[PDB]
C-alpha cells in the first residue's frame, strides 16, 4: 500500500502520497468559523471550514492560525486540520495507511506525547513516526548525516543529524520565519509609504515575497549600488489596480534571516546559529555538518541565498571556502519530499511505531522511537 506524507506547517500544511514528485494538497493552516450570527438551513452549511474551502469562503469566516512559531498550542484545531487532511484532502481513512509526521525542533515532550496519543487513540493509525523537519530536509537531499537549516512559517532552526538521528543538545532556535518576514515586509513597505490593513493586502504582500524578493551576494555592496541599480526596483499589481513598488526592501526582508538586528532583536542569524550549533557538537561530526548543509522551507526561495550562505560561512569559518551549500529547487516541500523518500523505502518498516507499542509503553514511546 502507498503511504501518506503530510507536512503540518505553520503557514501551509501539505499532504500527499509517498513517491509523488509534488504534494497533491497544499492548503493554508487555517480553521474558519462563521463570522456573523445566523442559523437558517441553506442546504446544510458546514459549521467549520478548513484549508482551501476555508480559503475560498474566507470573507464570511473568522480564521484561526493555530500553530504559533512552529509549536502547537491549540490542539482541537490541529485535530480538525488532521481530520481534513485525511478524510477530505486525500480522501482516506487513517487506520490502514502508515502516516509520516513532522515536528518543529526543540518541541516540548508533552506536545510529542499528546500528538502520539491523538494519532493512536482518535485516528487509530497502525503506524506513525515523528521526524524533525530538518532530518526529512536532509533526506530530500539524500544523505543521513549533517546540519540542516530549516526556516518555515513559524520558526527558524539549525539541527545536527547523525546517521538519521538528531542531537537535541546542539539544536539552535532563531525566533523568526516567513510570518515574521511577512510582518517585517508590511512594516518596511509601510515605511516606504503604503498601508496593509486588510486580508487581501496581506496575501498580495505574501505573493510579493513569493515572487520578487531575493538575497544578494553582498549586502553592503548592493546597498552601495541601491540608488544606482536599474534592475533592483520591482513592482506588483493588485487586481483592483493598486501598485506596490519595492526597491532595496527585496533584500531587506530575507536578510533579516542573515541579520536579525535589522528588525530590533539581538539573536544570531541563520549563518551564526548554524556556526554556533556546529561548534556545540562533537568535533568529529563538524566536517560532515559543513559538507551536508541543507537549507529548507519556503523562506529559502529567495534567489541568491546559496552564495550568500556560502560567503557568510566563508566569513565565520576559514575551513569552508570550497564546500557548497546544497539548495534543491524543490526545497519548499523538502520536508514533504524527504518524508516521501523516507516512507516509500522498504528499510523504514521497522522504525514505525505500532499500536501495541503505545499500549504497552504509554505515550513516552515518542521519546524513544523518534530520536
Partner 1 sequence: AGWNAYIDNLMADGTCQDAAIVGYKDSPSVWAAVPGKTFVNITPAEVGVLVGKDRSSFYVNGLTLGGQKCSVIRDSLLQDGEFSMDLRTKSTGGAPTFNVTVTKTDKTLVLLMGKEGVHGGLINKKCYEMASHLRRSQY
Partner 2 sequence: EPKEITFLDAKKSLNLNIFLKQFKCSNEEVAAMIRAGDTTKFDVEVLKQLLKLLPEKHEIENLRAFTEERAKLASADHFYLLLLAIPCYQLRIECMLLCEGAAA
Ligand X SMILES: Nc1ncnc2c1ncn2[C@@H]1O[C@H](COP(=O)(O)OP(=O)(O)OP(=O)(O)O)[C@@H](O)[C@H]1O
Task: Residue 169: name its binding partner from partner 2, Mg ion, partner 1, none (Cβ under 5 to 8 Å by kind).
Answer: partner 1
CB of 4 to partner 2, least distance (A): 16
Residue 122 touching partner 1 (CB under 8 A): no
Which residue in 160, 297, 339, 363 binds ligand X (CB under 6 A)?
297
Which residue in 44, 193, 264, 329 binds partner 2 (CB under 8 A)?
44
Residue 9 touching Mg ion (CB under 5 A): yes
Residue 107 touching ligand X (CB under 6 A): no
Give the residue with the Cβ less far from Mg ion, 9 or 260: 9
30 and 51 Cβ atoms separated by less than 8 Å = yes
Which residue in 6, 9, 146, 278 binds ligand X (CB under 6 A)?
9
Which residue in 37, 39, 40, 43 binds partner 2 (CB under 8 A)?
43
Residue 103 touching Mg ion (CB under 5 A): no
Residue 169 touching partner 2 (CB under 8 A): no
Residue 12 touching ligand X (CB under 6 A): yes
CB of 304 to ligand X, least distance (A): 13
Radius of gyration from C-alpha coordinates of the chain: 21
| Contact flags string 130-169 toward partner 1, x per CB under 8 A | --------------------------------xx-x-xxx
Task: Residue 7: name its binding partner from Mg ion, partner 1, partner 2, none (Cβ under 5 to 8 Å by kind).
Answer: Mg ion
CB of 347 to ligand X, least distance (A): 25
Task: Residue 70: name its binding partner from ligand X, Mg ion, partner 1, none (Cβ under 5 to 8 Å by kind).
Answer: ligand X
Task: Residue 283: name its binding partner from partner 1, Mg ion, ligand X, none (Cβ under 5 to 8 Å by kind).
Answer: partner 1
Give the residue with the Cβ less far from ligand X, 153 or 320: 153
Residue 280 touching partner 1 (CB under 8 A): yes
Distance from C-alpha of 100 to C-alpha of 367, rounded to nearest angstrom? 16
Give the residue with the Cβ less far from Mg ion, 7 or 272: 7
Distance from C-alpha of 303 to C-alpha of 323, rounded to nearest angstrom? 19
Chain residues that interact with Mg ion, rule: CB under 5 A: 7, 9, 152
Chain residues that interact with ligand X, rule: CB under 6 A: 7, 9-12, 70, 104, 133, 152-155, 177-179, 182, 206, 209-210, 297-299, 301
Amino acid at each position: 500500500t502507498t503511504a501518506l506524507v503530510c507536512d503540518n506547517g505553520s503557514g501551509l500544511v501539505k499532504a500527499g502520497f509517498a513517491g509523488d514528485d509534488a504534494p497533491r494538497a497544499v492548503f493554508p493552516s487555517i480553521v474558519g468559523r462563521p463570522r456573523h450570527q445566523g442559523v437558517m438551513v441553506g442546504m446544510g452549511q458546514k459549521d467549520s471550514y478548513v484549508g482551501d474551502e476555508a480559503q475560498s469562503k474566507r470573507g464570511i469566516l473568522t480564521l484561526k492560525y493555530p500553530i504559533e512559531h512552529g509549536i502547537i498550542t491549540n490542539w482541537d484545531d490541529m485535530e480538525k486540520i488532521w481530520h481534513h487532511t485525511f478524510y477530505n484532502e486525500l480522501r482516506v481513512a487513517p487506520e490502514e495507511h502508515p502516516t509520516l509526521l513532522t515536528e518543529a525542533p526543540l518541541n516540548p515532550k508533552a506536545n510529542r506525547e499528546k500528538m502520539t496519543q491523538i494519532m493512536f487513540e482518535t485516528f487509530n493509525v497502525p503506524a506513525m513516526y515523528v521526524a524533525i523537519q530538518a532530518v526529512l530536509s536532509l533526506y530530500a537531499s539524500g544523505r543521513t548525516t549533517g546540519i540542516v537549516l530549516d526556516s518555515g512559517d513559524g520558526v527558524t532552526h539549525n539541527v545536527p543529524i547523525y546517521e538519521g538521528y538528531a542531537l537535541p543538545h546542539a539544536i539552535m532556535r532563531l525566533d523568526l520565519a516567513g510570518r515574521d518576514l511577512t510582518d517585517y515586509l508590511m512594516k518596511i513597505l509601510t515605511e516606504r509609504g503604503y498601508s496593509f490593513v486588510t486580508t487581501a493586502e496581506r496575501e498580495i504582500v505574501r505573493d510579493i515575497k513569493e515572487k520578487l524578493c531575493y538575497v544578494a551576494l553582498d549586502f553592503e555592496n548592493e546597498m552601495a549600488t541601491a540608488a544606482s541599480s536599474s534592475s533592483l526596483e520591482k513592482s506588483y499589481e493588485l487586481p483592483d489596480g493598486q501598485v506596490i513598488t519595492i526597491g532595496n526592501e527585496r533584500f531587506r526582508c530575507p536578510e533579516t534571516l542573515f541579520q536579525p538586528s535589522f528588525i530590533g532583536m539581538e539573536s544570531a542569524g541563520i549563518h551564526e546559529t548554524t556556526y554556533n550549533s556546529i561548534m556545540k557538537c562533537d568535533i568529529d561530526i563538524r566536517k560532515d555538518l559543513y559538507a551536508n548543509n541543507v537549507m529548507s522551507g519556503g523562506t529559502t526561495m529567495y534567489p541568491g541565498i546559496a552564495d550568500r550562505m556560502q560567503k557568510e560561512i566563508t566569513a565565520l569559518a576559514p575551513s569552508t571556502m570550497k564546500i557548497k551549500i546544497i539548495a534543491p529547487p524543490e526545497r519548499k516541500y523538502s520536508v514533504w519530499i524527504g518524508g516521501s523518500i523516507l516512507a516509500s523505502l522498504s528499510t523504514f518498516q521497522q522504525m514505525w511505531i505500532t499500536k501495541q507499542e503505545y499500549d504497552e509503553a504509554g505515550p513516552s514511546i515518542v521519546h524513544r522511537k523518534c530520536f
